[PDB]
Amino acid sequence: RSMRKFTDEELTQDEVVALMKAALMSPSSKRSNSWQFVVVDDKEKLKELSHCKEQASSFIADAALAIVVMADPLASDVWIEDASIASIMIQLQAEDLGLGSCWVQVRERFTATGMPSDEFVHGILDIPLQLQILSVIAIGHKGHLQWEKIHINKFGGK
Amino acid sequence: NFSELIKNRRSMRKFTDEELTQDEVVALMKAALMSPSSKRSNSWQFVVVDDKEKLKELSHCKEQASSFIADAALAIVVMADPLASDVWIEDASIASIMIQLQAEDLGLGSCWVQVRERFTATGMPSDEFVHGILDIPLQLQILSVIAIGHKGMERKPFNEEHLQWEKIHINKFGGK
Numbered sequence: 001r002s003m004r005k006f007t008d009e010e011l012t013q014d015e016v017v018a019l020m021k022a023a024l025m026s027p028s029s030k031r032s033n034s035w036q037f038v039v040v041d042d043k044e045k046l047k048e049l050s051h052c053k054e055q056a057s058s059f060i061a062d063a064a065l066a067i068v069v070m071a072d073p074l075a076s077d078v079w080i081e082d083a084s085i086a087s088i089m090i091q092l093q094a095e096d097l098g099l100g101s102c103w104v105q106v107r108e109r110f111t112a113t114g115m116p117s118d119e120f121v122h123g124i125l126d127i128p129l130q131l132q133i134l135s136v137i138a139i140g141h142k143g144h145l146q147w148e149k150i151h152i153n154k155f156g157g158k
Numbered sequence: 159n160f161s162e163l164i165k166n167r168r169s170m171r172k173f174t175d176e177e178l179t180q181d182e183v184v185a186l187m188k189a190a191l192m193s194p195s196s197k198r199s200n201s202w203q204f205v206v207v208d209d210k211e212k213l214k215e216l217s218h219c220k221e222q223a224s225s226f227i228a229d230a231a232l233a234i235v236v237m238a239d240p241l242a243s244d245v246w247i248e249d250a251s252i253a254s255i256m257i258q259l260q261a262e263d264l265g266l267g268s269c270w271v272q273v274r275e276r277f278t279a280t281g282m283p284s285d286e287f288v289h290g291i292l293d294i295p296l297q298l299q300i301l302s303v304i305a306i307g308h309k310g311m312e313r314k315p316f317n318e319e320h321l322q323w324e325k326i327h328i329n330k331f332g333g334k
Contacts, residue, residue, distance in 0.1 A: 018161065020326050021318070022161075022164060023326075024321045024323070024325065024326070025164050025165065025316050025321070026171065027167070027255075027258075027270070029272060032265060033222060033322060033325070035325065036325045036326075036327065036331075037325060037326050038327045038328075038329070038330065038331060039326060039327065039328055039329070040329055041328075041329065043327050049220055076274065077275055078272055078274070079246065080247045080251070081247065081251045081254075081272070081274075081302075083227050083253075083303070084247070084248045084251035084252055085251060085254075085255045087248075087252075088251075088252050088255050088256070089164060089255075092160055092259070093160055093161065094163070095160070096159055096160030096161060103194070103329065105196060105245055105248070107245065107248070108244050108245055115212060125329075125331060126330045126331055126332075127330075127331045131331075134248070135248075144186060145191040145192065146191055146200055147191070149191065149200065149202060149203050149204060150187055150190075150191070150204050150206060151203065151204065151205045151206065151292075152205075152206055152208075153205070153206070153207055153208065153209045153212060153292075154205065154212075154292045154293045155203075155205055155292055155293045155294045155295065156293070
């Protein structure tokens with residue numbers, strides 16, 4: 001063991017492909033598939049990318065892989081919904097493979113110096129301005145339900 | 159498991175008349191409540207609708223895109239508190255898809271009916287319409303209605319020939 005959020009242990013090509021397929025099979029409004037994905041395995045880029053989080057993300061920095069989820073807002077007015085779906089599909093597929101993941105939120109977030117996290121990520125990964133970033137899903141080998149929120153047939157019951 | 163779950167999952171808009179069991183309803187409700195959310199704050203709320211007259215009313219929330227809600231066994235309306243989370247859209251989205259994935263796991267069908275930034279036949283926000291049907295406080299924003307039921311037709315699995323590999327970029331946009 002170590003403090004790393006994810007172990008040394010390398011992803012297989014089969015696992016990496018399975019993750020990409022899960023992303024690409026995500027259901028999207030009108031099958032618009034507004035999303036795109038940047039798959040980051042370079043260690044110095046994972047270290048840079050990790051500062052997209054106000055306090056830098058050690059999940060990103062220690063990851064085997066990170067998948068940056070983005071979307072074209074002209075392809076879909078519900079690009080946020082569509083990208084969120086794709087984010088979850090990645091994480092659930094990771095879990096099914098016996099890997100771990102961490103969703104680092106990018107939309108509406110800021111870096112340590114108050115730069116919009118989307119703007120920061122655009123600069124790190126050379127992403128066109130036409131795409132908007134939702135999240136970074138960091139992946140690797142891993143290092144009380146609120147029933148009051150359920151209403152039956154109307155809000156507050158009856 | 160999950161791999162075949164997502165291959166086989168398709169939007170279901172025809173349903174049989176078979177009632178959901180309480181065990182199924184609970185499983186779906188638990189999937190909603192188990193959703194990971196920003197801050198672990200859980201901004202969301204859910205209205206679970208089995209009343210046929212209310213399903214009929216909800217089915218008008220978008221003209222004809224929504225009208226198959228009337229034939230569903232259950233609808234779960236997913237909403238969230240924008241003051242508890244500035245990423246309430248993400249949080250509600252995640253809960254929405256977790257419900258659908260649980261439905262698939264149970265052998266039921268589902269369809270996501272988008273409410274946010276959609277409009278009724280008369281140009282009323284669908285969110286405002288649904289607020290009126292289910293007496294939801296105006297603070298909460300509605301994302302979606304998940305219609306659930308026994309599947310009334312088969313749908314084809316996803317054909318991997320049609321995976322859009324051009325949307326995968328290695329290390330930087332446009333990288334291979």
